[model samples]
Target: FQGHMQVVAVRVWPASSYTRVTVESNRQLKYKQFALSNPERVVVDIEDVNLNSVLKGMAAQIRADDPFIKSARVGQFDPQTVRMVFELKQNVKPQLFALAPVAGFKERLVMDLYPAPLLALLEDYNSGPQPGKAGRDRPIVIMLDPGHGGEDSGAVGKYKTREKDVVLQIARRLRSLIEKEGNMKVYMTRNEDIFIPLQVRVAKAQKQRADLFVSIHADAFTSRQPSGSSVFALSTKGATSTAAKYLAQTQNASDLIGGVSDMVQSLTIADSLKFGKAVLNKLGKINKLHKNQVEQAGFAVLKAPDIPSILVETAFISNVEEERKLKTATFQQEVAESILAGIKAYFA
Candidate 1:
């Protein structure tokens, strides 16, 4: 017989920027958590459950390429408790919290490891450009935000393709495209699989003093008929369309889905619309545009007070035709090319 509290999954997301350790269970996980210094480690003690196979295999999940974690070990702490130890490669600041069920997930216990002795713009100083560096001919810093990551798998397609993975892949393609421009510099809110809060994503754009922010995502809906790409800008008034309204609701909810979370008064609408228009026009060439015009919404990631921001729904993952295209290397490359072309179009 199994205990009522069952550990169903253990995930490790290792990024050069940060590390995340997540434990998903059928029920809430009660734990005593702590971090160590001498050898640099983290420990999470789960009470009232046996060491399940899911957690037992956690050790093998620690990849040698992992940035922070060196190794992981699982053993019984007591008759009804299991202790999980995470040995770290370096010093880190750990935050531990619990997440209630959302989407396809059960209750989750998450441990986030951030580099210690954090300096200014501590979000992920190990990566990205130095903030506030200005010059007469400053490179227009563009911030590309991949919609969801880690625990928040955005949307899942009929073919089992996850939104988080698709967006990340698209962002990577977009990054290299932007890099080739030479005159323009780009930074991503997250370059890895780690879940970054919405507010943090906005702050990162501001911290980097990005000239513009583009949040990329794949669309989804209850019916597979809704297909094509869409672009959105923040609307201080109200959403332009009911579909835009619903899209905002889902994008804004990413914080809750990612686990713990928790924006803004600013209408960068004029520039945002101009920016979105260029994007929409170019995107339309590769794939059918969801809406001919750039729509407006109250998306959380687009609330940066100073920067012109837009959210690009690459395609509807809910639509089988679009989902198939969204996953193709050819389509992904073309999408990135168009976004870059749009950026140049706006500047011109």
Candidate 2:
């Protein structure tokens, strides 16, 4: 449509095929839509999207399972916007995420899919040594991680608190509380409002020789009914629980997230399993101390060598009521305090 800008592009690789959708506009666009199951359709509702060209291209070149695409088309349910839908033969999970800003364009929201679902890559990277410490007595250096920053506000809350801001506040408070104990020196992956890659989080901790690392996050579960605070460590036994399995499959979608350059996708399923097992050994130690205090799931930021690490889900931001609690200074502080207590108990 005229006067609309292209703000997002989605690449979906279903069980049998791959589809791409680009959203453009002349004005700032606002639309909310999701992938529909049963008939297997990708429903994208956007204002002023140029659909004639998109549909023509999809019908001609896109593939369904391989080089064969069963069907591709566009629909206009309203005068202002268009709904671009992809029809497939079979059902597959599609991961919806926004790509980071690169070479020419500004930030673009992206939704990608793979033969295997993505799981957040979470793990424990080994830290070298504490600078001032001699041996065991050398206070363990722990890096407190706060997720999302700058342009990435992550999941938003009704109270209007941004995930990046709230987590940063919580992390800062946690750092102070940990430092007061005097048994450990504290390092923060990020102390300011800026985007830091998950791999960079581990590298930073490794540089500091942190004894332990904890990444903080507020989870988002749609339906607004699922709410709770949970914690996760790295998994070695291939995601023991259903939730871990689900998270491993989709959450480990760390390939999309920025991280260390050398790490590559496991060559085979067995390789991935082996890598997970190695990671679990270190995570197990932390889990032993905290019990369920430490859970195992894939998180992009947990990519590290030997340091015992974990990601804590402080709460669910998807719920309207819980979002309010996450926004409160008192609630954020309480979360930090609880983590501090958990860490102390773990080390002692």
Candidate 3:
């Protein structure tokens, strides 16, 4: 009887909402899991994996700022089994799932620890701004999603700029800029380096009753020649062209790279087009336009049934000149300004 698996890598992503622990290996893992309460701990015993350096290194990856984990340990429990335990900061629930090998990742086992189950731990974060009952219409709510994080780095530039980092910084700036508008309320799907599933991002907007949702990203291509910026709206009629089809295919791949992971509403597609146009026009002034008109595709991230949504390709990270500028904080601020300007124009 001889079948053993090797641990290729292990990582921990801790956020206020939850903590995710992932193990990437050559094959699907077989393990037994249980939780204890007096002091709070979650334990797992793997039946096939060897106690490995990469797996052992997982203990070192837990940080002091982690919300739920106090510490972690890994060791061989028997001749053929390896055991890992998490000393928890509080009572928690774990959701276990497996992802087949995709992209550069090997088969993966994921464990997410949440303080509460179906309804997440009730925290003090306020939802959004609302006016007095008789005050008038409430301020428009905007939900900004910065694509790719934690496990998914999205695209990489020749200069080593990760698409994830650039887009998040830009989203932060856009949030700041929107706050200054005084008549609008803005929220981010995530504020830290955590990976939120595509549906959850859409759910966040729906929960916020967002009037508009924008998914921000830096585009890349097979080569460095593709340059300029583009904006996309979900197309009920299918892709506008091959490039739009290709873009949809590539962007949807985020759910795959990010350790695993919706569409809707009739008549909303046209509104998405107008929203994309407003933002696309502003982006063109700062950089070359990838397409003169807003492109359409069935991008899953842009599929919030009631919310008008668009995906913004800030610029081609594959283009050296664009990457150089997008990597700069100053240029990113301008990006925020232009996006906010677009919002205002659309509101009018």
- Give the per-residue Cα lDDT of candidate 1 at 79: 93
Question: Which has the greatest TM-score?
Answer: 3
Best-fitting candidate, measured by lDDT?
A: 1
Residue 332 error, candidate 2, Å: 1.3
After best superposition, candidate 3 residue 291: deviation in angstroms?
Answer: 1.3
Candidate 3 lDDT tens digits, 9-80: 888988777888998888788888899877789998877787877888888999999998999999999988
Q: How much does candidate 3 score in TM-score?
A: 0.89
* 1-348 per-residue lDDT for model 2 (tens digits): 322435333332222222223332233456665777677675656665555554445454454343213466766678767775666554535444444444233444443332220123221222355555332567767888888654345566766666777778879988989778767788887676544556666777777777677777765654577666666666544655666556454444333332112233232223323333343333343322222333555555665655666766666676676678777788777777777766655553
Candidate 1 stretches with Cα past 4 Å from truth are: 1-3, 35-40, 117-137, 261-267
User: How high is each candidate's TM-score?
Assistant: 0.89, 0.54, 0.89
- List all candidate RMSDs to the true structure: 3.9, 15.8, 4.2
Which consecutive 10 residues in model 2 have the weakest lDDT in total? 117-126
Instruction: Show where candidate 2 strays beyond 4 Å.
Output: 1-3, 6-127, 130-136, 158-160, 245-293
lDDT of the candidates, in the order given: 0.84, 0.56, 0.83
Supply the global lDDT for candidate 3: 0.83
lDDT of 1 at 336: 91
Alpha-carbon runs more than 4 Å astray in model 3: 1-5, 117-136, 260-266
Candidate 1, residue 39: the lDDT equals: 78
